Symmetry: C6
Subunit: 216 residues, 6 copies
């Protein structure tokens, strides 16, 4: 990664194993993405590829990921074209799609772009593309649909709500969505026992209010 002068430094073995072990244990649950992002702070494209390449298995997901990167790389090339003339020896060349992905660019060039003034954030751009691909994978890997998440007759309300927002996080729900969902759908899939109470609270009720009410 890059760290403060701004200097490249090689990825740590603890960071490498941390990421690999998370994928082994968690597969593609939603929380793996913000963990990925955290372990990859200030990461170059090489660092990012290193983290992705070190994962054994889930090679279907890894292939789908490369497809998403191609689309973003293609769109980048459309919005950011570059001439194919002779490269100027003194100063850096302009990065195209595959350079940001780290397939057609050296570590020297990646550092050059990230540490320049003003910097070309090729690591931030590429991480962006990866999170987009990882979100597609989480969406696809989500076991259950939100419609099949309903409170069991003898299930604690807290457990039902945990499964509800666990599922809802996997299915890529915006806060706009999540907030409407809690108002609408959360109540309707609850127990008849619970739903009787929950209606009594009526409108705008907090999840705090709802969960204390149905503790019974």
């Amino acid at each position: 990664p890059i760290v403060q002068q701004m200097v490249h430094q090689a990825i740590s073995p603890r960071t490498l194993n941390a990421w690999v072990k998370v994928v082994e244990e968690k597969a593609f649950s939603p929380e793996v993405i913000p963990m990925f992002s955290a372990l990859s702070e200030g990461a170059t494209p090489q660092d990012l590829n290193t983290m992705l390449n070190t994962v054994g298995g889930h090679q279907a997901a890894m292939q789908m990921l490369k497809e998403t990167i191609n689309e973003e790389a293609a769109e980048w090339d459309r919005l950011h074209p570059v001439h194919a003339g002779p490269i100027a020896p003194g100063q850096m060349r302009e990065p195209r799609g595959s350079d940001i992905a780290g397939t057609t660019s050296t570590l020297q060039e990646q550092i050059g772009w990230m540490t320049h003034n003003p910097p070309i954030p090729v690591g931030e751009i590429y991480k962006r593309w990866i999170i987009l691909g990882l979100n597609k994978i989480v969406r696809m890997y989500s076991p259950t649909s939100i419609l099949d998440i309903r409170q069991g007759p003898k299930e604690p309300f807290r457990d039902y709500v945990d499964r509800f927002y666990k599922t809802l996080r996997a299915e890529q729900a915006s806060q706009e969505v999540k907030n409407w969902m809690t108002e609408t759908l959360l109540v309707q899939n609850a127990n008849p026992d619970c739903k009787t109470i929950l209606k009594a609270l009526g409108p705008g009720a907090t999840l705090e209010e709802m969960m204390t009410a149905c503790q019974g």
Copy 2:
């Protein structure tokens, strides 16, 4: 986090795993909060969101947390309004509710606010809001009420007292409360055998005095 010049540095993988493992093992017992606070020393809002987002499961608690942050963000916006004019290129903009929560602010802006002279402590303000939400969750997750914590006929007094203050800590008791509780309620829920002795000590008796007396 921010560390001494005051510079941002990326959260460590040991800190990340430390927090995640504590939630896996302890769930929402009272001691998880001061641990959270310790692992998040000098943390930016991004760091704080990273720590919260990396937790898998307890998504009911995570939703309730976001609700508490909205309330604090709303109250912040009331007490600290800002104009919607054109942003001055040279100098920082003024942070509103969602900027402190890290949803509508970049890492650059978060560092800018925290490292300024005088600093706008957006990390300390946001951590404040989170602890308030976490305390609500601990309160709700507390298994037993203090009224059901009573000394068993064949239970050591120390074990009874451990359960008593364990429960009492979860139910959000101030030192004002805790000190009155030890005087009043601790004695009344003890064994008849013990209570006979404990009264003999009478008033103002220490917990040290009480525990040595009932060792028998």
Copy 3:
């Protein structure tokens, strides 16, 4: 903690877990205290409270601890009074009992006192108070009395001596005491077989001398 300029630095996650795991495994055996002291080198009151607050369970001991701190805080206030006038903006205020305990003082103020010339060692003063409270807890948590520690007919002398000084350490024996104990009480609770030999050594005999003699 504070480290060399003298600068505050946040407690490490390895130090935090180290302390928590020691309490989980050892409870309140005597050796937990010098371990506590070692993990808390140069610790501020906040650091010290962090270490104490992170411990789950033993909440009876934690309450007794707070009682000991109140007594030391009260005695400190008696011996070190302070005026309740307006606080001088430029320079630090004088610390009272609860400021040293970290309940009524900020981290800024704690650093200010510890890093001043001359320094007000609020961390050393507070650690002092804590060790006093922890020693009370170890004393109370000691399973057996020294009088019930006697050599079994078929017990190796080394094992008997280990239990003897293990118990004796828990019961808060000064070196003045320990040295008299080895002369007097250690010999009398030994086996008749052993005691026959041990008397033969007579007076001033070393533990080295005693243990080699009874190896048989």
Copy 4:
């Protein structure tokens, strides 16, 4: 390895054990190579030999590796000859094949070449040769042929695709190849149930499109 002045520093014990444990657990699965590359960032030939020599077992693979290095060393000597005159005391000598491999060169000389201006990247050249040898080993160690990777009548499409690209990665498929393979061969080895759908998508279909279609 070499790190920023550019200075040699000895390989870490965490890095050493990290590499050894990966070989113990994973043997020669494809992901071991980018892990090797990551643990060996800025590595000297000595560091690289240290990492290779510390591996117990797979001595057949280690021998094949040395054979690949000889070929690259021989080709290097052909393309980069050097005179056998007297060595100039003041300045460095020119590196030949075995010097890059670290068999006939000291650590001093390896540092000298890597830290010079302009540098002779003997670590990068040697790592290159090693990855070429490791890829030969992975190819040979691949358990199954891509032709025997077919979707079982009662196998989830995702599992079939994971085995497909797992196998395909071991057999050294270029992106040129992989992209043609997904178009052609992936579809033909699927279930009759699946293949009926997959054809319906027809041409250019994404793996994202294919996997959602056959989720059924």
Copy 5:
């Protein structure tokens, strides 16, 4: 410990646990001493006491240790007396026996002595005294006598030799002794089968020579 200006730094939690775990696992086998010495490089008397005090159990050994320190402290006081006049405010006082042991001296004073020019090596002197006490403990804790270490009729010679020098190391054998022992006693306690060969080698024979001869 003290490290390079020469500055005190607090003992690490990894070093603390490393030492504690070694005593838990190994008890007082000979190799524990050079491990102790290594974990205590540049250690102050406080650091040394911290390491000794953190050990739970073996309190018989810990008591014997304190007895050895008293003897060395007493001998130090005899050979290095000091006046009991008023202490000079500006400059350090002269260390007596208990000051080196860390019982009657502060950390400030310990640093003062160790970092002075010329330095008074109170850490090296005290470590010296401790190793002397630890060697007494290892001697006493040695399970078997060298006379009972004999080669079993069906025992490999290597295993016999391992037990021989394992025992011999515990019983505090100098190289003067060890070298005479290999010549004399090692041969006589071997098998009749082996001893027939071993004599054939006769005088001055290496352990290398002896072990290859009896491999049969």
Copy 6:
């Protein structure tokens, strides 16, 4: 060890445990030697003795090691004599055999020799002597002879080759030897089934070629 000014620094607890655990698990397999060398980069004689002394068990090997060091120390003294006059106070004395081994030299003197300009590499010289002794031990500890390593009728060729070069590495085979061995002896100890094919390849055949041929 010594690290960049060139300064001594105390061996790490992670390095110490790393070495000890490797000997516990691997005993004296060939790969333990390059691991030893890696953990001991820039090590002083004290560091080297620390690493050797911390090993519990294999005391037969440790004794044989000391014998090899004596021989190298004796040869050093022959080739590098020194006068027994009065030592010059200002400047370093010249190191003799036992000084390099760390038995008759202080840490100060060891640092003095290693950090001088020009340096006397007492750590490199001593490590040299140790590897020579460790290679003797590996040779002796090798379980099987290369003559008894033959391909089983129903054994995969890869497994046979792994055992072949595993054994061959223990028996101290030079690359001159190893390369002749693969040509000659590897083929003759293979299966009749395999040997029929392997001859067909004939002369100069690679191990890569041989292993792919007999995969069947």
